[PDB]
Design a protein around this nucleic acid. Structure first.
Ligand SMILES: [Mg+2]
Lengths: 536, 110
RNA sequence: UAGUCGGGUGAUUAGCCAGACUCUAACUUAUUGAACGUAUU
DNA sequence: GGAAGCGAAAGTGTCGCAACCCGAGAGAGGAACGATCTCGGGTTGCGACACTTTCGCAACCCTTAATACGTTC
């Protein structure tokens, strides 16, 4: 109508799409939708930025599990959830993953269904209303500032049923699906990495049926919690084989075989006609696949391989190189780890688990963003539980910075209990989870203290409520006691203070921080007393 | 199954006739109907239900008529929520009831 | 026996009384339209 | 007819298990090596069940109705 036309010309994506669907100026509306999704600019740092960003803004949980009512505001870039009560933290990530299942389902199939809330486990046990709600609001540029979705479930036997409200999510996912069908676009990545990602590696890898090469394999088990590192390895070996081979040589060889078979049928051998028809079909299929590959605007296998290799080596500190070796009629992925060439099964658990996360994520981003110069600059939402899992302090100090550098437009929602990780993150990104004895909280608060660039010891005390020295060790209190003894006299070493000083010296050593502090205390108190005498 | 579904949930869905097996093989019309009337006292002498299905392939599709079942089941459900009432039992025991027993298998589902 | 029909009574959609019927076998429905009854004209 | 959300019905694919095979290795009897038993890695077939697809219940009442009271369709 004229109203839709005005709104569409004003930049409203849904109105433009509705006009496109009714008329199917059809070309103009299609172009407007496609430009809304694809337009973007390269910033001063050389990073591509979409003009219309996609992220989760807000989440509300009503009578869900232990929560009566909980509201969370999320940052566009990075949100970190902290707290001792780690079972509630995981509940929050589960709620988000279920919501994201609705986008994935509808990008894959018209009328796709995402996941539903459980009547048994998701409804709070003492809920008066006997239903549960998970409400989410997404943002997609100024044209679509609010995309609300609600997942709901009522108890059995209630007077009224509580149904989910998913139409806005489906409408948006439909735009992505339909526009992509006509003309390839870049698509959003959704992924969940739970503690399940720590699992051992099956060294034996499965024969390539060729599901892994299909673009929408990027959405396979993406919200399951462990990634699919096995799928990566299969896909990566596949890429290697194609790079070493020529593409269309099989077509040229098949073309030659069909030509040879055609000559035989022309020479009077009618018995081989059935075989010719089969080979012609194979040739047509190969050309079609080639054409579809050509039509799908996908990156060359060589380029795909290179992108992923770079990503892995950049993010995973111990890995400098990754490649496929053809040995013993069996393809093996090898890595240079800490300067030495090893198989994946020879890596440490910390290295393997982190490698698996990054490899999985990069594979999916490459598959879903074929039109970007750097496919890892694509859009998406990634959930990571216990990011510090298996990581040494040195890696904890770099992990968030490395991830954000490799995937600059992903919205990361993470959980941690690491002060070292928190030292690299702004307090605005931090949400603290301090529930009551009933496990129930209303809002999640940012800490008072700035964490980014702060000392770890301060974060421990001010944010995580942990003393810098272990309270259950006597020696941890000696310097405090020593100070008290000095203050109880004028500030002179009495017999008691001297004994303790000697104990500190004996235990911690002559050049210990503890002893230096004691020495400092003596010196300052002596100087205070001298001042006092001069004044008297 | 339509009464049970609607006692459990407002607008619950009961079961359906099979389009593969339940239509009579040599029926000239390619659909089946199962029509039932229930009685619930002199204040509700007739609760008619019809389940219908057209054969697989057929272009015309025959609709079920289940609203009376839903209407009655709504009364049971709503009245019960305000003040507890006794509810009707519906059960089928077919020849599938003869099964091996297993104490070790437990249902962790509800 | 049960179900059904219904003459009466009953501050009356109940209850009670009387009489009767029985193909395997009623389940009381829908307007502003149409038709029928009543009113108005 | 059939919105939007939902689940029944029916077909397909995945995946973990159990059974089995094989070569390696320590080393019984007393000098001649290697008997017997177990480790550890791999292959195969099976079947339970997770995933996928399709159907179908029935909102709304289209710009467009009349209004004395009843009954029927
Ligand atoms: Mg009338």
């Amino acid at each position: 109508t004229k109203q839709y036309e005005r709104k569409a010309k004003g930049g409203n994506l849904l109105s433009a799409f509705e006009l496109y669907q009714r008329n199917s100026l059809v070309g103009e509306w299609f172009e407007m939708c496609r430009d809304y999704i694809q337009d973007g600019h390269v910033d001063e740092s050389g990073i591509f930025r979409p003009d219309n960003a996609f992220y989760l803004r807000r989440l509300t949980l009503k009578d869900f599990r232990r929560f009566s009512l909980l509201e969370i505001k999320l940052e566009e870039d990075l949100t970190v959830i902290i707290g001792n009560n780690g079972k509630g933290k995981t509940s929050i990530l589960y709620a988000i993953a279920k919501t994201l299942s609705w986008f994935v389902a509808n990008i894959l199939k018209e009328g796709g269904s995402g996941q539903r809330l459980s009547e048994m486990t998701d409804i709070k046990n003492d809920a008066e209303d006997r239903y549960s709600d998970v409400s989410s609001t997404f943002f997609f540029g100024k044209g679509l500032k609010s995309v609300p979705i609600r997942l709901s479930r009522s108890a059995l036997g209630t007077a009224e049923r509580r149904d989910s409200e998913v139409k806005p999510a489906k409408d948006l996912a439909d735009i992505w699906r339909v526009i992509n069908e006509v003309n390839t676009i870049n698509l959003p990545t959704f992924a969940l990495y739970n503690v399940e990602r720590s699992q051992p590696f099956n060294r034996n890898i499965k024969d390539n049926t060729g599901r892994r090469e299909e673009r929408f394999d990027a959405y396979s088990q993406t919200l399951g919690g462990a990634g699919r590192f096995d799928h990566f390895v299969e896909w990566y070996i596949y890429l290697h084989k194609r790079t070493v081979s020529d593409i269309s040589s099989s077509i040229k060889e098949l073309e030659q075989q069909v030509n040879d078979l055609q000559r035989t049928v022309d020479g009077g051998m009618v018995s081989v006609k059935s075989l010719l028809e089969q080979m012609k079909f194979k040739l047509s299929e190969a050309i079609e696949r080639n054409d579809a590959a050509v039509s799908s605007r996908v990156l060359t296998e060589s380029v795909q391989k290179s992108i992923v290799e770079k990503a892995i080596c950049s993010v995973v500190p111990s890995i400098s190189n990754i490649w496929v070796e053809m040995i013993t009629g069996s393809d093996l992925v090898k890595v240079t780890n800490d300067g030495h060439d090893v198989t994946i099964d020879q890596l440490s658990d910390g290295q393997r688990v982190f490698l698996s996360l990054v490899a999985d994520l990069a594979r999916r981003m490459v598959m879903l963003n074929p039109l970007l110069e750097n496919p890892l600059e694509g859009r998406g939402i990634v959930l990571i539980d216990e990011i510090e899992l298996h990581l040494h302090p040195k890696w904890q100090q770099e992990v968030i910075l490395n991830l954000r550098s490799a995937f600059p437009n992903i919205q990361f929602i993470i959980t941690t209990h690491s002060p070292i990780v928190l030292s690299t993150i702004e307090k605005r990104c931090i949400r603290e989870f301090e529930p009551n004895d009933d496990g129930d909280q209303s809002f999640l608060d940012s800490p008072d203290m700035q964490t980014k660039g702060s000392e770890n010891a301060q974060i421990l005390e001010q944010v995580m409520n942990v003393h810098s020295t272990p309270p259950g060790i006597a020696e941890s209190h000696w310097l405090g006691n020593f100070e008290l003894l000095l203050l109880d006299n004028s500030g002179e070493l009495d017999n008691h203070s001297q004994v303790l000083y000697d104990q500190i010296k004996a235990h911690f050593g002559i050049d210990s921080i503890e002893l230096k502090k004691a020495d400092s205390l003596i010196r300052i108190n002596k100087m205070k007393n001298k001042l006092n005498k001069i004044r008297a």
